[PDB]
Amino acid sequence: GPVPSRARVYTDVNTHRPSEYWDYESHVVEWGNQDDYQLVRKLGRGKYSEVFEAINITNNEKVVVKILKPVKKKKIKREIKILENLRGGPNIITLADIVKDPVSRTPALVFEHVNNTDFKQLYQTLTDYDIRFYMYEILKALDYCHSMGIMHRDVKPHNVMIDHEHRKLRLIDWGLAEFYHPGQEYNVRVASRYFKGPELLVDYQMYDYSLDMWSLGCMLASMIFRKEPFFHGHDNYDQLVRIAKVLGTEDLYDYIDKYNIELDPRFNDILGRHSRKRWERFVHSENQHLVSPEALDFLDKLLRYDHQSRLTAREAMEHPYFYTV
Numbered sequence: 007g008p009v010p011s012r013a014r015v016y017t018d019v020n021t022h023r024p025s026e027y028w029d030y031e032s033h034v035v036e037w038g039n040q041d042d043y044q045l046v047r048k049l050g051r052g053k054y055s056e057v058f059e060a061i062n063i064t065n066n067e068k069v070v071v072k073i074l075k076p077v078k079k080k081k082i083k084r085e086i087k088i089l090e091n092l093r094g095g096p097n098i099i100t101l102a103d104i105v106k107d108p109v110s111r112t113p114a115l116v117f118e119h120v121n122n123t124d125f126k127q128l129y130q131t132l133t134d135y136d137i138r139f140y141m142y143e144i145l146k147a148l149d150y151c152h153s154m155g156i157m158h159r160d161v162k163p164h165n166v167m168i169d170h171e172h173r174k175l176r177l178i179d180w181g182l183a184e185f186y187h188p189g190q191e192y193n194v195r196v197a198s199r200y201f202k203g204p205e206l207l208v209d210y211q212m213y214d215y216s217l218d219m220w221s222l223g224c225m226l227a228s229m230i231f232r233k234e235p236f237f238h239g240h241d242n243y244d245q246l247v248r249i250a251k252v253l254g255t256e257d258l259y260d261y262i263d264k265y266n267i268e269l270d271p272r273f274n275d276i277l278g279r280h281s282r283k284r285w286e287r288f289v290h291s292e293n294q295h296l297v298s299p300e301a302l303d304f305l306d307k308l309l310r311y312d313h314q315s316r317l318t319a320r321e322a323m324e325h326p327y328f329y330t331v
């Protein structure tokens with residue numbers, strides 16, 4: 007069978023805490039008063055959620071209400087417990103309240119409001135220092151949730167809210183987040199296609215916090231090279247081929263051999279043979295203002311097939327790319 011693996015950092019943080027911390031199924035959810043909130047307008051619509059701007063009538067504070075389609079109760083309990091555990095963490099979205107709709111029995115999470123601006127609109131005003139600054143803010147959030155024995159498992163631009171005016175960043179959407187337990191085999195059907203790590207794509211279940219560091223690398227690559235998404239797969243199999251076209255096929259086969267992974271037969275038909283590309287090959291006149299040798303060295307240390315070989319969030323914080331922050 008596959009070779010076992012464990013996180014290089016925060017390995018046993020959940021083993022040493024009482025069951026109450028990580029046993030989300032036993033968590034008792036208590037509802038606030040839905041009448042304390044007046045819906046203003048629709049902001050977005052997720053996979054299993056509708057998002058509204060609202061105001062807390064009791065204190066005239068603007069909030070965001072995430073109305074959840076109750077498809078899986080266990081999943082709701084998991085998101086709530088994690089948000090409760092991480093509440094007050096650096097750059098972690100604050101869960102302010104949990105409420106229910108009496109008539110339709112619909113649960114809703116209430117969050118602090120963030121005056122967000124999308125990636126496409128943000129890029130034009132972003133300087134090299136700004137990317138270093140915000141990347142460091144994401145790292146503080148990841149080092150914090152990893153230290154708390156939690157893997158985010160859905161790191162992507164749509165899950166990072168940025169109020170550029172106030173230079174305020176918040177890591178959101180903890181619906182796919184999970185507690186890390188060494189030796190545990192997790193569901194690989196997590197993260198969004200473009201950000202899925204190689205461990206997910208080759209069905210290696212014993213993954214850890216390093217999954218988020220791959221997703222962070224995908225984000226950095228799309229910014230510094232202005233290629234969104236960086237690895238543009240059309241399905242989960244094709245996603246690995248797009249990674250192999252950059253990282254080369256040699257290091258991929260070294261990875262599957264190292265962990266004794268049984269690669270799906272479909273890959274022989276589509277994977278092929280690819281050289282390992284130099285990161286400098288993606289530099290052009292439109293994107294060169296956000297590229298530096300430090301940026302490329304840093305990217306090289308995140309975007310590695312071997313999940314054990316990627317920088318942890320704390321190691322990433324110590325990289326020369328962030329000496330200016």
Ligand SMILES: CC(C)c1ccccc1-c1ccc(C[NH3+])cc1Cl
Pocket residue numbers: 122123124125128129132136137140141144162163164165166167168225226228229
């Ligand atoms: C600077 C920032 C951390 C970043 C780096 C790499 C890729 C994208 C982004 C990014 C993330 C979220 C949002 C707002 N939803 C906007 C942007 Cl520009």
